[PDB]
Amino acid sequence: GSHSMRYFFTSVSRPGRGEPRFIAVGYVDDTQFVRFDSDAASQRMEPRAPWIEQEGPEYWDGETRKVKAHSQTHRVDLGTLRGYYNQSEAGSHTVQRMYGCDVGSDWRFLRGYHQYAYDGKDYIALKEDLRSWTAADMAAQTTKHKWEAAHVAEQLRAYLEGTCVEWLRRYLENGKETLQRTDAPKTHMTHHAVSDHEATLRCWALSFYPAEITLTWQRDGEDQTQDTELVETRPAGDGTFQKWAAVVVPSGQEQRYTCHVQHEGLPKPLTLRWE
């Protein structure tokens, strides 16, 4: 179906402890493929998926060049923002930036994004039309006007609609066996006695890709949303994901409960019951 490429950048000032930390990561869908860490030894963009490793030296030199430029930009931006908000020189602050593109099932442009945050909240973002900006506060209205007059939207729009989508297409085909796979969850239920009169039913989904999944419990076909223990979807470490959902059941009531699993990889949604 749909696919995405996203870059995520984090810059953290360290007053009286040297240069700000800068970390950049790239993803296609739920798979990381590159990284840069200002505190690492290489000072280069580095591969994090096997399928990007076969890009040649011109790729890696070019990506290293651009990410150091991103790094320098952000170094400068931390100072600008400290002034804007009249903050002391001594405190650690955070800038985050995210951009990339979505393609549809036709692998043609679907949506573009470019978002910017300061200390954990919205600062400025490119709107959906990729032609205008949303400034979160009064400081960001200054940036909005600066960026309008320098035509920053125009430059990003050409990237997000053109080159971003072209590279996404190339990564998808070069990493076909990683990126164009769907791994259906392996599912099962566990039963454990909380006491003589109560037991936990835990419904498991394991080793699935992509991360998008829905796990729910019903009792006699009624939603148990407010009485289900649901964990956040979590990485297994091997590029697959995990999720579980548990309910507490009065003993004797096991057959009343059903766990329901929806995932891209299942031909049909599953309904699991204990005995």
Binding site: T10, V12, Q96, A117, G120, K121, E232, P235
Partner: protein, 100 residues
């Protein structure tokens, strides 16, 4: 400024089987700012060779990291994750449970 407490999950990569190699994971998510300390413990004691994922964030700007290490679970060894962050009055310790 914004501060969000980390959510913490401690689990193995594969179903835990005594005597079989695996990875022990501590996934920390939903936090801000990014400065965070995470240790994996075996019988109370800091595990020395522990790696982590590259710092990234979700739609809401909150950070997430995966800390992990090779391990071979046994009947008796106990594992935990110990996390410190500006939002915590003291380090949060979460025990590894094999069915969670």
């Amino acid at each position: 400024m914004i501060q969000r407490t980390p959510k913490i999950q401690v689990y193995s990569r594969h179903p835990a089987e005594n005597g079989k190699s695996n990875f022990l994971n501590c996934y920390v998510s939903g936090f801000h700012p990014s400065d965070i300390e995470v240790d994996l413990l075996k019988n109370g004691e800091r595990i020395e060779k522990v790696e982590h994922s590259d710092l990234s964030f979700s739609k809401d700007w909150s950070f997430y990291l995966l800390y992990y290490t090779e391990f071979t679970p046994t009947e008796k060894d106990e594992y935990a994750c110990r996390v410190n962050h500006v939002t915590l009055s003291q380090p949060k310790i979460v025990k590894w449970d094999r069915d969670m």
